[PDB]
Design a protein around this ligand. Structure first.
Ligand code: HEM
Ligand SMILES: CC(C)(C)OC(=O)N[C@@H](CS[C@@H](Cc1ccccc1)C(=O)NCCc1cccnc1)Cc1ccccc1
Length: 451
């Protein structure tokens, strides 16, 4: 301190930082609105201070390719550290440098196309659970909360896909597993006082309720020693040129996949149904393609799902509006120059996906929901270093192919059977949480009707 001179030195524009807070008071209207502003106010690059922490925002497609890909293993290997985490330093989204490069390898073959295809039947089962719970609310002409019934499903999928556990978490009951995964303002006080993290690290306060982890650490070694098709198996099988996956390293990834596939796959499905409801022609047009490919509500398979192109367009276009991650970020680990610009050591290099997904200089009518942007006719003109809902380069979303497949299966079954209509209590237009997650302000609630 005071590092508050750095962007002024480098000749990089940005909002003036108050002392000890930097520009955080600017987060009051959400990250996303702060970025769209800085984008319009400052141009292709700009800088700011999460407290003392210089952040440099970059928007050039080459520069972005340079960072996420060309210079990844060398400079931009790790994300910004948050804490305290404790035994979850070892998880892959969190681990650093070579310990990450190791973990990526041991868990890469798990997410192969082939391995995903064998997951299709188990993921097909709980689609049926989802419909039945839906009809129980469709026959009772009462509006529905989507995050609940979708979460009940996303949860249903994770537990089976990662450990084989088989529950109907919605109704079926207080089953021992639905609950420790229920614990599925502290993160703002980290930023003004990140010098407090190692304090908490010697205090073993886990941002994970310290008890859940104790449940799954022990719940894992029960399953481990009961068997001795799912992720736990695919990981136990891996630990049988890199030291093998340890037992706690195994518990920690299981956790990272449950946070991954749960309030992401649940949230996105919600965002997709909202758009399908407020846009009934797209709903019908998709229900058609679904019925032409799967006549008679024929069960989808892995191959039929990669055959629905409109489906893919609705998914991509939605994730254009709602890129759950909002920003991507990497820590610059060394003095570097990229595409003719000095970047000094320690700076956090941030890419604002949300404000690029909503940039008029790359998107005509960017607030509108137009799936045609992703027709095979126009999908080619889309700069891949602007549309990045799963990241890019070696450190992108390892669970990309599974999430897409997981979500697409849900929609197919559900649009085969119901249509979705606004209620008077629907929030139109939907407004994003002014907070710090990509969720709707108010929960998405609609009317479900049976075909
Ligand atoms: C629609 C759902 C999802 C979206 C939009 C999404 C998007 C992302 C993004 C943007 C990142 C960071 C990429 C980067 O920094 O370049 C990421 C990372 C990650 N995702 Fe996903 N993700 C989704 C679901 C999942 C799922 C279902 C899994 C399944 C286990 C998963 C596992 C991971 C992991 C482990 C990382 C960290 C990668 C690493 O550091 O090596 N994600 N995801
Ligand atoms: C801070 C550093 C650089 C050391 O670690 C990260 O920043 N990592 C993430 C931090 S939040 C965290 C939620 C959590 C809650 C409780 C325990 C662990 C984690 C996550 O690890 N979630 C991955 C699954 C997932 C979620 C969404 C999409 N894909 C996978 C942010 C992030 C992850 C992943 C993508 C973008 C940001």
């Amino acid at each position: 301190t005071h590092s508050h001179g750095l962007f002024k030195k480098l000749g990089i524009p940005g909002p003036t930082p108050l002392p000890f807070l930097g520009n955080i008071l600017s987060y009051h209207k959400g990250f996303c609105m702060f970025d769209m502003e800085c984008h319009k106010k400052y141009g292709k690059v700009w800088g700011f201070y999460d407290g003392q922490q210089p952040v440099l925002a970059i928007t050039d497609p080459d520069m972005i390719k340079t960072v996420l890909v060309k210079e990844c293993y060398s400079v931009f290997t790790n994300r910004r550290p948050f804490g305290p985490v404790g035994f979850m330093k070892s998880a892959i989204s969190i681990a650093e440098d070579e310990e990450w490069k190791r973990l990526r390898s041991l868990l890469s073959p798990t997410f192969t196309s082939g391995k995903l295809k064998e997951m299709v039947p188990i993921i097909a089962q709980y689609g049926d659970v989802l419909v039945r719970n839906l009809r129980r609310e469709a026959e009772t002409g009462k509006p529905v909360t989507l995050k609940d019934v979708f979460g009940a499903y996303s949860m249903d999928v994770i537990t089976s896909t990662s450990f084989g556990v088989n529950i109907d978490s919605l109704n079926n009951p207080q089953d021992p597993f639905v609950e420790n995964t229920k614990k599925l303002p502290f993160f703002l006080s980290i930023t003004v006082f990140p010098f407090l993290i190692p304090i908490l690290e010697v205090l073993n306060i886990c941002v994970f309720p310290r008890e859940v982890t104790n449940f799954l650490r022990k719940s894992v070694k029960r399953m481990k020693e009961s068997r001795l098709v799912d992720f736990l198996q695919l990981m136990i099988d891996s630990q049988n040129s890199h030291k093998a996956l340890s037992d706690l390293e195994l518990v920690a990834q299981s956790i990272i996949f449950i946070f991954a596939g749960y309030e992401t796959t649940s949230s996105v499905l919600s965002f997709i149904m909202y758009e399908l409801a407020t846009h009934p022609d797209v709903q019908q047009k998709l229900q058609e393609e679904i019925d032409a490919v799967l006549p008679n509500k024929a069960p989808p398979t892995y191959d039929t799902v990669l055959q629905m192109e409109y489906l893919d367009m609705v998914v991509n276009e939605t994730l254009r509006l709602f890129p759950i991650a909002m920003r991507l970020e990497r820590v610059c680990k060394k003095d570097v120059e990229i595409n003719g610009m000095f970047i000094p050591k320690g700076v956090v290099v941030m890419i604002p996906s949300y404000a690029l997904h909503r940039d008029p200089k790359y998107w005509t009518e960017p607030e509108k929901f137009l799936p045609e942007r992703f027709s095979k006719k126009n999908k080619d003109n889309i700069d891949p270093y602007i549309y990045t809902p799963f990241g890019s380069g070696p450190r992108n979303c390892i669970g990309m192919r599974f999430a897409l497949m997981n979500m697409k299966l849900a929609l197919i079954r559900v649009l085969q059977n119901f249509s979705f209509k606004p209620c008077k209590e629907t929030q139109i237009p939907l407004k994003l949480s002014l907070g710090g997650l990509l969720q709707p302000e108010k929960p998405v609630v609609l009317k479900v009707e049976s075909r």
